[PDB]
């Protein structure tokens, strides 16, 4: 009745395997004794169904016990005011052992266990580590906490709302501007910051003291000039994915803190080069997790906001804008009706004509004119397809030369 769940607990204990491979090992063993010994097939098929399709009453998982023991000590070591500010005993080897064990459980065990024990009592255990991180100064332990937060964001999205609304993104954004020597901590800090901002949820206003415009200039100076200690050159492609994610919850490009960074910078070229290599493929590097509701496309959200003002539009060199128009045009046509993105490329194109002198050089204007007349003459009746046509009319109405026949 409950065999398939009581075996997985036995196997994970005495082998250390993950949840997935625990089910594989049993499905293979059973599925092979069933075939070699047909006399046992009725018993085996019940056993397989228990896997495909709960635990006994008092029996509690091993991974659930450990998370009661780990979250309880780390919160006890947080509430130990003496040992934190006035150290006497050694703590780096014990804490490093509980945080390693935690990272192997969140990474391998069943997510629904690791979800409830983190969602328990209104995220009491998550929010402690977020404070212990603020309290701890040792980078050997700040690094393991980041690897643990990155595993908790993959489980649920309610945890992301808990972290982004907390003080974590303000300490990372403060440790990165200050402690630039540690390369791993600077590269993981920029990963977690992109995780928690991935969903587009808003944040307290107080975060913008350390996540505002001076933090963007710091990230642009790294994207453009790089660091000396960055030998492998991972950090520019992480400080790009982070800027794309900060700009997700930020509305009203005129009021945007990031765009004030671009318009203040002397010359951005490497940040613009990288935005187009992402647009050519239509890949959202911020979208690491498969959590609903799926937020918008981070790149187009950015470029829609770049071209929401003419001060930020002039960052693109001449050769790059023409490559941006060749791409946007190619996607508008290659995309099918009923897609969500087609109005984004259209709204993006509408933003280019306003804030740039597109009507003086008119690059790919004939190929564009033929595509908009098609989209208006499309007889589709979905609501989304009516939103596209609604944009095109506004685009042609504002600029008439986009409605004329190609010539």
């Amino acid at each position: 009745r409950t065999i398939g769940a009581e075996l997985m607990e036995l196997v994970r204990r005495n082998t250390g395997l993950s949840h997935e491979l625990c089910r594989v090992a049993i499905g293979i063993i059973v599925g092979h004794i069933q075939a070699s010994v047909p006399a046992s097939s009725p018993v085996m098929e019940q056993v397989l169904l228990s896997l495909v399709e709960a635990l006994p009453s008092g029996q509690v998982c091993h991974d659930q016990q450990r998370l009661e023991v780990i979250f309880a000590d780390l919160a006890r070591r947080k509430d130990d005011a003496q040992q934190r500010s006035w150290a006497l005993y050694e703590d780096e080897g014990v804490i490093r052992c509980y945080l390693e064990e935690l990272l192997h459980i969140l990474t391998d065990a069943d997510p629904e266990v690791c979800k409830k024990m983190c969602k328990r009592n209104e995220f009491e255990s998550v929010l402690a580590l977020v404070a212990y991180y603020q309290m701890e100064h040792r980078a050997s332990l700040r690094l393991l906490l980041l690897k643990c937060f990155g595993a908790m964001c993959s489980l649920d999205a309610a945890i992301i709302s808990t972290l982004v609304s907390s003080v974590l993104p303000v300490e990372l954004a403060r440790d990165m501007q200050t402690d630039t020597q540690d390369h791993q901590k600077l590269c993981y800090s920029a990963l977690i910051l992109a995780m928690v901002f991935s969903m587009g949820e808003a944040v307290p206003y107080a975060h913008y003291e350390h996540l505002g415009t001076p933090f963007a200039q710091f990230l642009l100076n790294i994207v453009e000039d790089g660091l000396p200690l960055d030998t492998t050159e991972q950090l520019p492609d992480l400080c790009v994915n982070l800027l794309l994610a900060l700009n997700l919850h930020l509305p009203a490009a005129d009021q945007n803190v990031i765009m004030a960074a671009l318009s203040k910078h002397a010359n951005v070229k490497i940040f613009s080069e990288k935005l187009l290599l992402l647009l050519n493929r239509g890949d959202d590097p911020v979208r690491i997790f498969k959590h609903e509701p799926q937020p918008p496309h981070s790149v187009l959200k950015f470029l829609q906001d770049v071209f929401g003002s003419p001060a930020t539009a002039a960052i693109f060199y001449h050769t790059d804008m023409m490559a941006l128009i060749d791409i946007t045009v190619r996607h508008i046509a290659d995309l099918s009706p009923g897609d969500k993105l087609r109005m984004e490329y259209l709204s993006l194109m509408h933003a280019i004509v306003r804030t740039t002198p597109y009507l003086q050089h008119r690059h790919r204007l004939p190929d564009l004119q033929a595509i908009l007349r098609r989209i208006l003459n499309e007889e589709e009746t979905s609501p989304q397809c009516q939103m596209d046509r609604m944009i095109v009319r506004e685009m042609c109405k504002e600029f008439l030369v986009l409605g004329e026949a190609p010539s």
Partner: protein, 207 residues
């Protein structure tokens, strides 16, 4: 919670500095929160520190932690939930548990010592929380008796003497400079005979 921007290595250095310089003791707690809200320019100070890595300055606004730190002498459940009694009440139980003849002279000489009594207006509040507590007890007895005698009031006095950072040391130097010290001192000989239990007892307990 409020002032992020303090490095974790310099939170302790920053808290002592606020405590030693800006903090003080308030007559009433909730009335101070209003003074910090209604008139913030007058009560909120500023503390510029120095980072030790980048050598760049960091600044903060010093607010409710000016009176909230010292308040735990009088509301110690702010920090330790295992204790609720103020120090103004601990002193009254210490004295009312002492013999009836030496209760008045003990209220009249309350000596604040130690570095954590250097807070501004510490004795002024302790001397006030007691005189409330002492003038009422005498009032109640005057009522139960019949109101025929108005008992003499008690002269509470909380003095804060000039030497605090080395008060205890000074009483040890005056002592050691006597000859009486060299009699009560346990001795190497007495240790070899009786053993390390020669120093087992203290005045806090008997036998």
């Amino acid at each position: 919670d409020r002032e992020v921007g303090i490095p974790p290595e310099q939170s302790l250095e920053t808290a002592k500095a606020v405590k030693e310089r800006y903090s003080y003791v308030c007559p009433d707690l909730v009335k101070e929160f209003n003074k910090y809200d209604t008139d913030g320019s007058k009560w909120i100070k500023q503390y510029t520190g120095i980072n030790a890595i980048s050598k760049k300055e960091f600044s903060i606004d010093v607010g409710y932690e000016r009176f909230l730190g010292p308040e735990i002498f009088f509301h110690p459940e702010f920090a330790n939930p295992d204790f609720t009694q103020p120090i103004s009440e601990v002193v009254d139980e210490v004295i009312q548990n002492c013999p009836i003849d030496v209760r008045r002279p003990l209220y009249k000489n309350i000596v604040l010592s130690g570095g954590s009594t250097m807070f501004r207006d510490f004795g002024r509040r302790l001397q006030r929380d007691l005189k409330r507590t002492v003038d009422a007890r005498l009032k109640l007895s005057e009522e139960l008796s019949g109101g025929r005698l108005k008992p003499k009031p008690i002269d509470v006095q909380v003095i804060t003497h000039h030497m605090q950072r080395y008060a205890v040391w000074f009483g040890g130097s005056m002592l050691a400079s006597t000859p009486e010290f060299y009699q009560v001192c346990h001795t190497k000989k007495d240790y070899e005979e009786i053993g390390p239990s020669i120093c087992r007892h203290n005045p806090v307990f008997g036998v």
